[PDB]
């Protein structure tokens, strides 16, 4: 109606932000950016609701206006900047590096990483095509455009971005046996290897994935993210739980043993 | 075979037959025809205010013998004239000509109650004061 919306009602916010109902009428509307609104995590949510460094939105803005927060090695001062999957957030004042990777419960884990691993990131190739003057380029899942990619790189592949020069270190071809994290649907956050890709021309290709505990699930290729060349060899540190889904009874047993 | 279709593909016939036959149910018919909206003196409301035109005594029906003391009230919302019973011993003395009275039904939902013939409403308040409060001398009529 006459133009873009600028507000986000609290109840209409993505559920994986884990916002409380009664704290207010509105929720942080993520800005336009590398990641989609529904699949992002604004820095205000990360710094106040997750890390609890800031006590309120005034404080998260005070933190970010002092140039502390970096996303993918670049300073961001937008409190609603849409950080997303595989993004690296650096707070060198506290000497902390985080990567936004889904945990098996469907949420963005607070996943601390070493400084050496915080120097790169992975990106799922969305499309490969030719730019002006016949220069090929790759579009990753976070909207990055890398020119002159390896001519072997195709869609659904994973590239390793140097994240300081923006170049491609090396890549992983999408194929059977590759380590995968699921980035959408009800299997979001699970980690396994590709068992069989079932093609459907004009429809949605389906990928069969086997967990490390030999559990098999099916998910859309659009929800499939290659993160490693084989089982047990991920190119990034996995969050606690290793993307292994436990039943609610198993979780209850594990909590009973963990707590006594 | 019980006189109704049983085939797996006869849902249209069953639905239409039920739809035709619910019109024989007066509650459904009155709800969809909107008779309260069109015909009811209150227009579907629970209560209605009006002005007292005259105080009238109505002879009760047999085998009872008494004078039920009612009033003729002209409703403000639509100008219709109705007869409203004034409950309790001596509350007619609380009702004067050209008073504003709030009316309500007898609880029989449009029918006359008891031996009172042709009367379907009762006085709840007069001059903005509850008739029960006036009867029990809890409050006084503003005059």
């Amino acid at each position: 109606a006459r133009g873009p919306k600028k507000h986000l009602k609290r109840l209409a916010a993505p559920s994986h932000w884990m916002l409380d109902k009664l704290s207010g009428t509105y929720a942080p509307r993520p800005s336009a950016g590398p990641h989609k609104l529904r699949e992002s995590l604004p820095l205000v949510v990360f710094l106040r609701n997750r890390l609890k460094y800031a006590l309120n939105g005034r404080e998260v803005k005070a933190i970010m206006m002092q140039q502390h927060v970096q996303v993918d090695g670049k300073v961001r001062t937008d409190t609603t900047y849409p950080a997303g999957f595989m993004d690296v957030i650096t707070l060198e004042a506290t000497n902390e590096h985080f990567r936004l990777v889904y945990d098996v419960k469907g949420k963005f884990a607070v996943h601390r990483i070493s400084a050496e691993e915080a120097a790169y990131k992975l990106g799922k190739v969305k499309k490969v095509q030719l730019g002006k003057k016949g220069v090929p380029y790759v579009v990753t899942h976070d909207g990055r455009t890398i020119r002159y990619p390896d001519p072997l790189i195709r869609a659904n592949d994973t590239v390793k971005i140097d994240l300081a020069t923006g170049k491609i270190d090396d890549f992983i071809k999408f194929d059977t046996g590759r380590l995968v994290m699921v980035t959408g649907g009800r299997n979001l956050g699970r980690v396994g290897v590709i068992v069989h890709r079932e093609k459907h021309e004009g429809g949605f290709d389906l990928v069969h994935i086997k967990d490390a505990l030999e559990n098999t699930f099916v998910t859309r290729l659009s929800n499939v993210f290659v993160i490693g060349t084989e089982a047990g060899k991920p190119w990034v540190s996995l969050p606690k739980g290793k993307g292994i889904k436990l039943s609610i009874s198993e979780e209850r047993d594990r909590r009973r043993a963990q707590q006594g | 075979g019980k006189g109704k279709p049983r085939g797996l593909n006869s849902a249209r016939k069953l639905r239409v037959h039920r739809r035709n036959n619910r019109w024989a149910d007066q509650a459904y018919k009155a709800r969809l025809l909107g008779t309260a909206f069109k015909s009811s003196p209150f227009g579907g409301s629970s209560h209605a205010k009006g002005i007292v035109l005259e105080k009238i005594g109505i002879e009760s029906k047999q085998p009872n013998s008494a004078i039920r003391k009612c009033v003729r009230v002209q409703l403000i919302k639509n100008g219709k004239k109705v007869t409203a019973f004034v409950p309790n011993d001596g509350c007619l003395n609380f009702v004067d000509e050209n008073d504003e009275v709030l009316l309500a039904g007898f609880g029989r939902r449009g029918k006359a109650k008891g031996d009172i013939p042709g009367v379907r409403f009762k006085v709840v308040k007069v001059s903005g004061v509850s008739l029960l409060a006036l009867w029990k001398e809890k409050k006084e009529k503003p005059r």
């Binding site: - | 105080k55 109505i58 004078i67 007619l92 003395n93």
Partner: protein, 56 residues
Amino acid sequence: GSLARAGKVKSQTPKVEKQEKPKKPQGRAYMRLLYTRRFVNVTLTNGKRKMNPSPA
């Protein structure tokens, strides 16, 4: 019908004041009072139990 007799009986009923009596207990105390009065000191007349025996 004639309206002259409205309020006849109530008007001519001889006024009697309510006798002043101690307040009855409220709430849990009242539930306790009924409980004892009906299940502790039972006053049944050999199977004839009446809540409000008129004086006779």
